[PDB]
Ligand binder design. Structure first.
Ligand SMILES: Nc1ncnc2c1ncn2[C@H]1O[C@H](COP(=O)(O)OP(=O)(O)NP(=O)(O)O)[C@H](O)[C@H]1O
Ligand SMILES: Nc1ncnc2c1ncn2[C@H]1O[C@H](COP(=O)(O)OP(=O)(O)NP(=O)(O)O)[C@H](O)[C@H]1O
Ligand SMILES: Nc1ncnc2c1ncn2[C@H]1O[C@H](COP(=O)(O)OP(=O)(O)NP(=O)(O)O)[C@H](O)[C@H]1O
Ligand SMILES: [Mg+2]
Ligand SMILES: [Mg+2]
Ligand SMILES: [Mg+2]
Lengths: 484, 469, 53, 483, 116
């Protein structure tokens, strides 16, 4: 009966050609007699072409192959929370069987034009630079791009850690569950990470999905899709997830590998012709549903690794134009002390203020444009020709604003801590203070505001909007403190 | 009984073997062809279909004749493991090549084995003092971590590594496993001399180290594998005999280069820069094995070569993400006569964190880097306009950076036949203080040359008094 | 005397600037040709590989 | 019927011929065709044998009968070869009769491994100040010569082949170094004159030349260095010393790119096959110094890379530098300024000769290397102000480079170099005019040759220097500064 | 000219020459400052910068980004205002007054509003 079974013709390099399997579906799962599972991708006339999920030493010519009858799919539901699963959603932590509310497929149509809404909820990262300059919204896709060792993962991590603020509560609709997809990372590096998550009691609301350096190409390529489904459950069921794709550059490396080995002819930099389609259909799966559909969101932070700062290379270019804005990290910025090494100049959030907080919005008026003008005047400064009172003026403020956005890892700030800082900088209360001392200003300021004018800090938080009198109290409060 | 095939095809390093019936040797299995010499080894790369496999030879294919009988050995390449191999020089095919008879171990293990699982992972942040200023201070190595030396040709990865062996390996106690991949046999012949002299290897005594060598004269199959042999040996000392293992690889690039050498003959469409399309995962299988686990610590230094001095070449690019500390050698810096020719701005480590090295060492680092990074930013203006066009604060930073830069150079004992000056070893506490003083300008009044090629801060005040006469 | 000493300096300095940027041009010229060349080959491979399949 | 010594061409084109049969054939075995054109068995498949032609395709036809040789690619070897000039198959081409052989080594032999080896220690005296002093070459060491076209790459190599005459003349069996010159991709005209100038200096008697000129077949130009290797290898094996010269590897690599692209292997960087490294690595690994247990024979690779607009970073050069034991980078900009041999110092290095050189010189050249190498970055910051600190140190570095200047075909002996470096680093010559530096070089040796004769004799006997000979020469130096 | 008239074509060409000059001089501005310039040049640059800004404009669609109300400009008002700018009949007004505004009305309005 060659309808439900095939014999192997040849096997090599993760691939097995197979005579038979007549009833097999495109993208169907097959078990080999030896145990190892595989996926059918090329149903040709004479034969079927299978990528393996395992090693192949164990597969020999003529060995019988078996139909599963299922397209690749994953367990979903809140049972996954806290678990470390592989691409197909098998526990790899050691904590035993996953309990699922059901099963999604790996590839799923993105929600149409019809069942969506405007992004209006903030996804607060607690990162001064990010939450004031490039505010991220519940439903939006936001690229994290830069060279190697620039702090891409760190940004993503510090975002996750922050959600503690809301996840230890009981208001289901303020919560943000995180899904972290590890693609092409080494295992120990995923370990080192799940450790830190626990060190911060952040694992009870996360789901790591791992396709490490050593796993089969198909699993790597697949992980992001499977993961997208895991967190699609949350969006569909009235809740909000956050998906971090760390990182797509590798996913494409692996997807290139399937294709070159399946012998599909290659595109530019040996990538397949539709490497763009690869990412587009994934990233579109992030969205903010309409009231009719449960108002659930899914938010995506893809990561992308460049070389030599070149953003004009194939893959980055692709995703850059797929997402609702990017955060550029730079090595140069880093080593001279800006950390996050965000590039204000190049970073954008296309949602913008729609996903900020009204209070933050109010005092962040024009900051991003100003910071641009600042680089402007600082470029003209290289002429080292005498400055006037206008350029020196904006130079002094831009330098202090720059400095005011620097932030230590693992320290996300509440909005009401962010707000007065920004206000002190913008309205120029920081402008007569030494640059090295702005460090001590920040904490010394907040310390004092908590101690004394806590009644403001608690209004900002509760109300999220600086009323006219609250600006007054804050105005007074800042001047007060600056005089020392 | 024995499973025998027939040689159907020979192309370069590739051999095709046909097997009479059903049971085809598994992929990765060793095959043997009897020669007048001794025997030729082969590794089943793929099943071509129709009872034919395609192998890679572990040696030359000169003289092979179509139709030849080929014996299946029913397992991956085997290697002697355990204490029996200490002070022995070994093959890719796990054989004695030190003209000193059979390595009489208990067990022989496959070179191919799956990398330690995720549950089996084990992390920790313990510094490993090296006595090297640039490293100690800027990118601290970690005990049981993965270290890598990056650089193009003749910048000094080998000599640097010999300095690490010098310090750590002596006062380490536990077992070492040195692996020469695709390097000079001279160097390997030298290292065997070097050990018998320090007494690390004692032909008549005990021994702390082991030697495995698939050198640059070997065919690409040999060189595509010899590192897996080293690894198997180390992995025993780690998991079975629960030991602290020092594992020096040199050079690990030569493994991926070998991979491409054969890749086309294996029938594969090439990838960017003409690399085997499997370059990432073929590295992940090998790298992910060199690791510390809940059963034993492994610290490993690997030498990374950098084709054409391009750091973005797809070989090294992919490496980085496998290391815990990365220290790059610049050609330009060596042409300044600065040694070690490390890049103070490109070198990194997970351990440079206040939680590990402490606020001061942390900050002395950062401040040093800002200084160097500024000097770097100005490289263009100084190139055209020179120093006179810089401001005052800028001007200072440069003279200071140029001092820090020269101070980062350190005489190595092993490299004595190149400096002339007997080599120096500074300590971690020694280095941090020294640099902190310079960053507080407590030495500004000293000629830049004094900072060049000397030990700690004491040696600077010395050389400056010597020259001031 | 000061002005005529300065003019002399400006001349001599500017002269050397021209020598250096002269030598730099030579270097970058060489680097340019390398990059060009490879640009052609890496671009070409992409097609060749694309073509075999 | 008996397709076991024989086969028939199925198809021929692009330098290959696919033969049918030849069932007993072995890989890399030679084959002869109906018109006496030699081929080589590349790959053996079921059904057919891929065979690479050592010649024009025209000389073959589909259908032709093809015979086995039974010989894996191999050459005549041994003492006889000296003073003769052969091609890639040890076929005589000077017309000086038949090649007199001792035996026949394979062109594909494997390298002496970790154990039969010994740290290189005997110097190879090149007679070239810049080399001997700065980047000296021991016997068994493998030193690269890498410059742009027209830089004196052969000059350097040729001059060494010349210098050995001091030693290859006398009774001393161990002081002798025989010369093997491969001429890969060169012109027929170039080789003639290169032989002429080797006979004009008598150096022919002690040297063998193998040449595969730019007309000859790709796999000839490819096989040439290997076959030369075995020829030289004979001496390294029978307890003697040989100096092989690979001129050049860049043209050999290119020949390989040919075959490899005609056999349709994927192109890597600059269209080179992924194994172009293994080509040179597996060649040079044979140049080597042997242990006391194996006669202590030695073979000294002097390969030549040719760069392109001064490019060290190129994919071939890197490969060869990462194989060899250092390199002598000859920079054109210096050579255009009349500096000969134009050795760039901060880019040339001997890796294993700094322990093989002659004592006498090392004593008298304390650090001379980075002196001049950091002298170059200084004088290139002058075109500023009068600084009598580095201005003083300038008067040296100029008289010093003026001192390295060597007219071609001028091999100096060690004892003759030592006094010049003496006065160099001791600055006995600063008061002598810049255009009287090299002129004095002749005047000074005239002065020493019939006065302080024993100083030359004792440095020629020992090669060392006591504090005894130090002051003994510090009288012969300032003496001639006055007279 | 056949399509938009000569005056339109001339303004449009001059505006272009201006910015083309200003672009060409950005070498000398970096290296030798703004100091080392011919007086005509100094004015051309002055005028080019003013012109660069007058080419921006708040879109209605993009209010979420500028918080500035969308301004729409009539084609004749465009040409007239650029003509004026070009002949120097506005050399006194500061650079910022041309940035993110509609017609020359808005340049004057902002000029005073800021000076206030
Ligand atoms: N604000 C910060 N202060 C100090 N270190 C930081 C900060 N943010 C990120 N880092 C990290 O910078 C290093 C690595 O950053 P990381 O998040 O790894 O970058 P990356 O893009 O993830 N690295 P990788 O993707 O592996 O090439 C250190 O491991 C971290 O300390
Ligand atoms: N810190 C150092 N001090 C003095 N010499 C050094 C130092 N580091 C490296 N070198 C060497 O730089 C050259 C080669 O060093 P080496 O360790 O060979 O480089 P490399 O990267 O190993 N060479 P290779 O393996 O062929 O790519 C000279 O042999 C030495 O001067
Ligand atoms: N020290 C020298 N003095 C005078 N002429 C020299 C000197 N050294 C080399 N030459 C040569 O300069 C020319 C070329 O030398 P040569 O050995 O050809 O250089 P090259 O790099 O070999 N040239 P080519 O082989 O064609 O790329 C003349 O052939 C020789 O005179
Ligand atoms: Mg990462
Ligand atoms: Mg090395
Ligand atoms: Mg030449």
């Amino acid at each position: 009966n060659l309808n439900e079974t095939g014999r192997v013709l040849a096997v090599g390099d993760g691939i097995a050609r197979v005579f038979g399997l007549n009833n097999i579906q495109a993208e169907e799962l097959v078990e080999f007699s030896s145990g190892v599972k595989g996926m059918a991708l090329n149903l040709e006339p004479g034969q079927v072409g299978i990528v393996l999920f395992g090693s192949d030493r164990l597969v020999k010519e003529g060995e019988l192959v078996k139909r599963t009858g299922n397209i690749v799919d994953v367990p979903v539901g809140p049972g996954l929370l806290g678990r470390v699963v592989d691409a197909l959603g098998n526990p790899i932590d050691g904590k035993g069987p996953i309990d699922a509310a059901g099963r999604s497929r790996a590839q799923v149509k993105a929600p149409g034009i019809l069942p969506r809404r405007s992004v209006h909820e903030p996804v607060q990262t607690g990162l001064k630079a990010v939450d004031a300059l490039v505010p991220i919204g519940r439903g939006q896709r936001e690229l994290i791009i830069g060279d190697r060792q620039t702090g891409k993962t760190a940004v993503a991590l510090d975002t996750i850690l922050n959600q503690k603020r809301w996840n230890n509560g009981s208001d289901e609709s303020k919560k943000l569950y995180c899904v972290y997809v590890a693609v092409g990372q080494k295992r120990s590096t995923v370990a080192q990470l799940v450790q830190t998550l626990e060190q911060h009691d952040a694992m009870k609301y996360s789901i790591i999905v791992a396709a490490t350096a050593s796993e089969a190409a198909p699993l790597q390529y697949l992980a992001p899709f499977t993961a997208a489904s895991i967190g699609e459950w949350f969006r569909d069921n009235g809740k909000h997830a956050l998906i971090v794709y760390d990182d797509l550059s590798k996913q494409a490396v692996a997807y290139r590998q399937l294709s070159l080995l399946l012998r599909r002819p290659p595109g530019r930099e040996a990538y397949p012709g539709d490497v763009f389609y690869l990412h587009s259909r994934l990233l579109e799966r992030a969205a903010k549903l309409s009231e009719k559909e449960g108002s659930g969101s899914l938010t995506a932070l893809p990561v992308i690794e460049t070389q030599g700062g070149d953003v004009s290379a194939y893959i980055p270019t692709n995703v850059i134009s797929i997402t609702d804005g990017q955060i550029f990290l730079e090595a140069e910025l880093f080593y001279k002390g800006i950390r996050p090494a965000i590039n204000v100049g190049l970073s954008v959030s296309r949602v913008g203020s729609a996903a900020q907080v009204k209070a933050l919005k109010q005092v962040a008026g024009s900051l991003k444009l100003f910071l641009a003008q600042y680089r402007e005047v600082a470029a003209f400064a290289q002429f080292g020709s005498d400055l006037d009172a206008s350029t020196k003026q904006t130079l002094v403020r831009g330098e202090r604003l720059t400095q005011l956005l620097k932030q230590n890892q693992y320290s996300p700030l509440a909005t009401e801590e962010q707000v007065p800082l920004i206000y002190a900088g913008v309205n120029g209360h920081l402008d007569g203070i030494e640059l090295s001392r702005i460090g001590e200003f920040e904490s010394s300021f907040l310390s004092y505001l908590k101690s004394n004018h806590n009644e403001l800090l608690t209004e900002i938080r509760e109300k999220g909007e600086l009323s006219k009198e609250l600006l007054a109290s804050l105005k007074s409060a800042t001047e007060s403190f600056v005089a020392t | 009984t024995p499973i025998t095939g027939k040689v159907t095809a020979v192309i370069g390093a590739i051999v095709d073997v046909h097997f009479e019936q059903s049971e085809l040797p598994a992929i990765l299995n060793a095959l043997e062809i009897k020669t007048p010499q001794g025997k030729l080894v082969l590794e089943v790369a793929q099943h071509l279909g129709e009872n034919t496999v395609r192998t890679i030879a572990m040696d030359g294919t000169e003289g092979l004749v179509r139709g030849e009988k080929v014996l299946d050995t029913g397992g991956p390449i085997s290697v002697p493991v355990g204490r029996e191999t200490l002070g022995r020089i070994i093959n890719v095919i796990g054989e004695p090549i030190d003209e000193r008879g059979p390595i009489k171990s208990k067990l022989r293990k496959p070179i191919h084995a799956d990398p330690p699982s995720f549950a089996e992972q084990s992390t920790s942040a313990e510094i490993l003092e090296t006595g090297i200023k640039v490293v100690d201070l800027l990118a601290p190595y970690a005990r049981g971590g993965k270290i890598g030396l990056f650089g193009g040709a003749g910048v000094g990865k080998t000599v640097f590594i010999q300095e690490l062996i010098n310090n750590i390996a002596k006062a380490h106690g536990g077992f070492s496993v040195f692996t020469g991949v695709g390097e000079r046999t001279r160097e390997g012949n030298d290292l065997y001399r070097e050990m018998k002299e320090t007494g690390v290897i004692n032909l008549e005594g005990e021994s702390k180290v082991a030697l495995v060598f698939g050198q640059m004269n070997e065919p690409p199959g040999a060189r595509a594998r010899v590192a897996l042999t080293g690894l198997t040996i180390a992995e025993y000392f780690r998991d079975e005999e629960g030991q602290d293992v020092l594992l020096f690889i040199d050079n690990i690039f030569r493994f991926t280069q070998a991979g491409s050498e054969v890749s086309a003959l294996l029938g594969r469409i090439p990838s960017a820069v003409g690399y085997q399309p499997t370059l990432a995962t073929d590295m992940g299988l090998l790298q992910e094995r060199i690791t510390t686990t809940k059963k034993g610590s492994v610290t490993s230094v690997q030498a990374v070569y950098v084709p054409a001095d391009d750091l973005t070449d797809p070989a090294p690019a992919t490496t980085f993400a496998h290391l815990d500390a990365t220290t790059v050698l610049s050609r330009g810096i060596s042409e300044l006569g600065i040694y070690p020719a490390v890049d103070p701005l490109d070198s990194k480590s997970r351990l440079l964190d206040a939680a590990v090295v402490g606020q001061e060492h942390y900050d002395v680092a950062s401040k040093v880097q800002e200084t160097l990074q500024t000097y770097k930013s100005l490289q263009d203006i100084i190139a055209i306009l020179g120093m006179d066009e810089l401001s005052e604060q800028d001007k200072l930073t440069v003279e200071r950076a140029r001092k820090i830069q020269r101070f980062l150079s350190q005489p190595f004992a092993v490299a004595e036949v190149f400096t002339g000056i007997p080599g120096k070893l500074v300590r971690l506490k020694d280095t941090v203080a020294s640099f902190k003083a310079v960053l507080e300008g407590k030495y500004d009044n000293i000629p830049e040359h004094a900072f060049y090629m000397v030990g700690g801060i004491e040696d600077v005040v010395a050389k400056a008094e010597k020259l001031a006469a | 005397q000061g002005y005529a000493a300065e003019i002399s300096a400006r001349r001599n300095a500017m002269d050397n600037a021209s020598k250096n940027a002269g030598d730099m041009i030579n270097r970058y010229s060489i680097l340019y040709n390398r990059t060009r060349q490879a640009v052609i080959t890496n671009e070409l491979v992409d097609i060749i590989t694309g073509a075999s399949s």
